[PDB]
């Protein structure tokens, strides 16, 4: 099936006088493989998975050099934005940045990304054509006119369609023993009473890879979002994930309901119910 | 691997 590579950058200011902090992390699908942190001792890009550790010293020195340059760019950007928005130097402010590529079953280019946020909200994004920009307001219009005149979009599109996709195919081959695996969920059901007319059923999915899943409730016909409480997919911490879906039903009809599980590790989609 | 060129907003 399909695969992806992503980098995430966070840059935060402090009152004074106080120096700003910078963090970068990288991911192949749902597996983190590197990090950088300006507050840390090493001042190096560092490994976070065992397959990246087989890159030699030329690889490590080049990622470190490139990330320090990134970090000084976003230091300047914090002061620029407080100027565009007429703010003071007494607060704390946040810039974020994400870029990367998707590939298909064939391992060929599918989609690319490159976008920013200031204080929570969208600032400027590259569109899916990889040719034009979305500016969210008057300040970000200044950023757009500056990047159009210096031809930033053309150089970004080359990276995203070529280089980016080549790093990802290399990482998939080197990390084959773990990156290519797909783990099917181990499933079960729980039941607690609340009162005499209603009780909570809960459908459980455990130990799957990757994170992508769908869990939907039905009764006789199809979908309902009536107290259909579902929680965000969470990491188990050993490289697999977990999820639950739960509905509160009229007590007595606890046999007309069916839970549905869709995962790419499953040979066939799963339907299960509660037995008396 | 990350981008080899950088630019200000």
């Amino acid at each position, epitope marked *: 099936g399909s695969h992806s590579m992503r980098y995430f950058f966070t840059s935060v200011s402090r009152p004074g006088r106080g120096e700003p902090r910078f963090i970068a992390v990288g991911y192949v699908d749902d597996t983190q493989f590197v990090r950088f942190d300006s507050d840390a001792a090493s001042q190096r890009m560092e490994p976070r998975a065992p397959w990246i550790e087989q890159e030699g010293p030329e690889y490590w020195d080049g990622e470190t050099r490139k990330v320090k*340059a990134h970090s000084q760019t976003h230091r300047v950007d914090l002061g620029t934005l407080r100027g565009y928005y007429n703010q003071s130097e007494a607060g704390s402010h946040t810039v974020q940045r994400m870029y990367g590529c998707d590939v298909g079953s064939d391992w060929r280019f599918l989609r690319g990304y490159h976008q920013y946020a200031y204080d929570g909200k969208d600032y400027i994004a590259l569109k899916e054509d990889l040719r034009s920009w979305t500016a969210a307001d008057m300040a970000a219009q200044t950023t757009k006119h500056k990047w159009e*005149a210096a031809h*930033v979009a053309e150089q970004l599109r080359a*990276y995203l369609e070529g280089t980016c996709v080549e790093w990802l195919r290399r990482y998939l081959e080197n990390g084959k023993e773990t990156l290519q695996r797909t783990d099917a969920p181990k499933t079960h059901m729980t039941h607690h009473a609340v009162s005499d007319h209603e009780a909570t059923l809960r459908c459980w999915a455990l130990s799957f890879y990757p994170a992508e899943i769908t869990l939907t409730w039905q009764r006789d016909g199809e979908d309902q979002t009536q107290d259909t409480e579902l929680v965000e997919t969470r990491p188990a911490g050993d490289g697999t994930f977990q999820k639950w879906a739960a509905v509160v039903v009229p007590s007595g009809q606890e046999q007309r309901y069916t839970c549905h599980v869709q995962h790419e590790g499953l040979p066939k989609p799963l339907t299960l119910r509660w037995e008396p | 691997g990350i981008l*080899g*060129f950088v*630019f200000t907003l």
Partner: T-cell receptor
Amino acid sequence: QLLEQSPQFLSIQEGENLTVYCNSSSVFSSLQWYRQEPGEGPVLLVTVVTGGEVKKLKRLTFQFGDARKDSSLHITAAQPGDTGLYLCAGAGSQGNLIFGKGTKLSVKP
Amino acid sequence: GITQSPKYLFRKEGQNVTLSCEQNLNHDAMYWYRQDPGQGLRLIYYSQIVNDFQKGDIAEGYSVSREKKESFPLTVTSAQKNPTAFYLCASSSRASYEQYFGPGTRLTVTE
């Protein structure tokens, strides 16, 4: 990345028309031309961006190849004010310009 | 504009010397090159953003700094035994885009 320029040297006559070449195996997102006299700062003449684009400045006509892997510089009715070293350059992936080694032109009365 | 001074510089062998480069063009990136007679440009050192620099193709025996956006000084140390050359500085609005060159400096090192 590598840019290769051809010919290294060209010596022609006042009023001749001529073309000089710049080539690569790989694609450039933007490309520039410069003219330099010895002991002096190079002068930027043009930036090109779109595959197939044509631009004209003074007696000069610049062409960007359709695949963005080469460019040419053409002079019409060359004059002794066109004498000098002509350099092509393109956007580098590590945050610089990639340069060719140049074509040195003399125009003779 | 972008300025280098002076036009001509002259020193004894073994003497460290620093060359000037300033611009009020509002550019983020600056570059240094050396050029020998009838030869091409050779990239020494470069700087994509204030407070960061990196090595070009012939960096041995030279150093730089970038404490301010406007200025990018070059020190020729008791370098290699090859210091005599034409030195050119250049600036661009962002790194990898079109460069504007200063007027140049001639340095000659003597016995």
